[PDB]
Amino acid sequence: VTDRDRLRPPLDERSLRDQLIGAGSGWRQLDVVAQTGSTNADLLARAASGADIDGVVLIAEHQTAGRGRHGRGWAATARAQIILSVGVRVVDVPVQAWGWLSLAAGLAVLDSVAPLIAVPPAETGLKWPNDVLARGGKLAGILAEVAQPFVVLGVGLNVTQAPEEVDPDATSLLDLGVAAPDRNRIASRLLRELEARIIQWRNANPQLAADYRARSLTIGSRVRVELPGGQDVVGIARDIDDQGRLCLDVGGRTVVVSAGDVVHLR
Ligand SMILES: Nc1ncnc2c1ncn2[C@@H]1O[C@H](COS(=O)(=O)NC(=O)CCCC[C@@H]2SC[C@@H]3NC(=O)N[C@@H]32)[C@@H](O)[C@@H]1F
């Protein structure tokens, strides 16, 4: 609404650079753009033209042609979200492990905003693959895309974004009770958490998988999983495997899902 605009000051690119680029940090470049079609598309394009995008950060105040998984979209209004993409060199890591990079990103986003909530409402955590949920609503969405030797990780985090503006199943920090969320502080914490999780992923650190399981809303829940191609499978999510795939219990039979949309059931 018009009133939420007063809760949406611009990002401070100068300050973010000061905090996030320098000794002790792996981020090599940070830019804030007023507007773009898709931050993911932009970093993919840079890589396609020969740019080294490892440790490169692109943040957009507004995104007009946002991309979701499986060809879906991502909606946004100006300054209502933290909208960013980062580049990650992955060629040094076995391809079977790349799926965990996306899971690590969701964990980073969750950890960056979790303390901002006074009372953690029911169902606050990670829905497989890496939706960030709070009170059943989708607080953030992550998209990982390949451009050898890189992966581009994209984060869309609803800070003051109203559900009526983007999606009926959406939520935001503001709609979770955070009266005056500071995107500058949140973006800084997010990128610091993200660096740590990427390093963990790159070194196959056991704590990454352990920390993910600890925050998983999906593991242990009855789910309907919509597979690519339109088929549904119903069962109980039991675990995540070493490729980041979802292990389903279907009446005693194990079904491993590499990609799909999860609906938590009663
Ligand atoms: N702002 C929003 N908040 C919550 N849910 C939203 C939303 N905008 C759209 N949605 C809903 O979520 C669906 C898409 O969800 S999804 O298939 O799991 N995909 C994702 O969650 C990944 C989204 C990644 C968006 C980031 S923002 C910066 C980066 N660049 C880019 O183009 N994409 C990534 C849409 O079909 C539906 F509209």
Automatic annotation (TrEMBL):
Gene3D superfamilies for this protein: 2.30.30.100, Bira Bifunctional Protein, Domain 2
Top class in the EC scheme: ligase
Annotated Biotin protein ligase C-terminal domain residues: 218-264
Keyword Metal-binding: no
Molecular function (Gene Ontology), one example: biotin--[biotin carboxyl-carrier protein] ligase activity
Domain named BPL/LPL catalytic: residues: 55-147
Coiled coil, from the record: none
Domain of life: Bacteria
InterPro entries reported in the protein's UniProt record: aa-tRNA-synth_II/BPL/LPL (IPR045864), Biotin_CoA_COase_ligase (IPR004408), BPL_C (IPR003142), BPL_LPL_catalytic (IPR004143)
Record keyword Signal present: no
Keyword set, alphabetical order: Biotin, Ligase
EC number(s) recorded for this UniProt protein: 6.3.4.15
Gene Ontology CC terms, in alphabetical order: cytoplasm
Protein name: biotin--[biotin carboxyl-carrier protein] ligase
